[PDB]
Design a protein around this ligand. Structure first.
Ligand SMILES: [Ca+2]
Ligand SMILES: [Ca+2]
Lengths: 195, 188
């Protein structure tokens, strides 16, 4: 079941792997130097370690995590969308059957950052990080049971449920936390550059 | 492994999970004694046994049927005793639910032989004597899904034969007196 994943996500998956918090602290530091491929590589490690815990709790094993490029798209002079594209390989295993499907995973995480207008002491507002099912894409690559066998659709739906739970419980919260660690002057500097 | 729950149940005895099993046993003993009917008590006993197995496993065996208990005299005072068993099997797995429907045939075979006591021979748990035929699967028959289902049912059926069905078969025959068994052998 997803019972073990539910409890793990309630505790926090970093309770299963103390190096997650260390990678988080490395990311915060690296980010403070934007305004003064390392960040992407820390994010790959972060996301990798998170999904490594998930593999211990579930049959959904996500690895080969790549983050090609973090980008910022200005939506005004005072706000921008921050995009984190994620790709990964997924293998779903079930009891007795072993490996039932191999999938290509694409997840696009997006969060807005905004700077208050009409002051020289501008506060920063990090917007919500939304777990839109359209942001999660799974492509069937292989199944030793046959590509059109019913077990494939079971594997796909199980992987989407797992990824969606992990995005809501871990990735989006950490994304917001990282952006909230940036300096007001830094976010200001970044939003302007994205126009 | 997966059969740990079944194995412990077989260690305690499956009648510890369903008090009606022993009642049928006594009914059978009386029924057999009466022949000096039985098939229906036999169906009931085997059915209840597999209903306990379904509480301990994903292998659900029901619609149990015993056509005719055959007895073939091998001498003046000995005979081969055959109980053919047919049943419907559904195997379930976590997540996937029911993976395969199977046709089961089991042949329970022993010997009875005649101051003088009634000897009941071995009850051999031969996997040649367990036949599982695939009827239906949601996941096709090309796959290893059916293979896993068949192998699961075979091991469950095999364990229950050795742990429950063959010992009970021997006890029921041992429960007849030398005169009773002598009369039944003659009726061939
Ligand atoms: Ca909490
Ligand atoms: Ca990289």
């Amino acid at each position: 079941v997803l019972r073990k994943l539910k409890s793990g996500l309630e505790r926090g998956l970093d309770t299963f792997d103390s190096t997650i918090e260390i990678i988080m602290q490395n990311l915060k530091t690296e980010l403070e130097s934007r305004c003064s491929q390392e960040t992407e590589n820390f994010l790959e490690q972060l996301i990798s370690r998170i999904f490594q815990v998930v593999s211990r709790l579930t049959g959904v094993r996500i690895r080969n995590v790549q983050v090609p490029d973090i980008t910022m798209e200005a939506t005004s002079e005072n706000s921008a969308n921050v995009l984190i594209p994620i790709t990964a390989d997924v293998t779903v295993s079930l009891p007795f059957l072993g490996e039932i499907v191999d999938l290509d995973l694409n997840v696009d995480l997006q969060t807005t950052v905004s700077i208050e207008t009409d002051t020289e002491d501008p506060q920063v507002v990090v917007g919500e990080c939304t777990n839109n099912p359209e942001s999660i894409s799974l492509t069937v690559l292989h199944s030793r049971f046959g590509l059109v066998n019913d077990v494939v659709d079971i594997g796909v739906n199980l992987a989407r449920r797992v990824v969606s739970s992990v995005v809501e419980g871990e990735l989006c919260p950490r994304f917001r936390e990282l952006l909230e660690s940036l300096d007001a002057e830094c976010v200001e500097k970044l939003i302007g550059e994205s126009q």
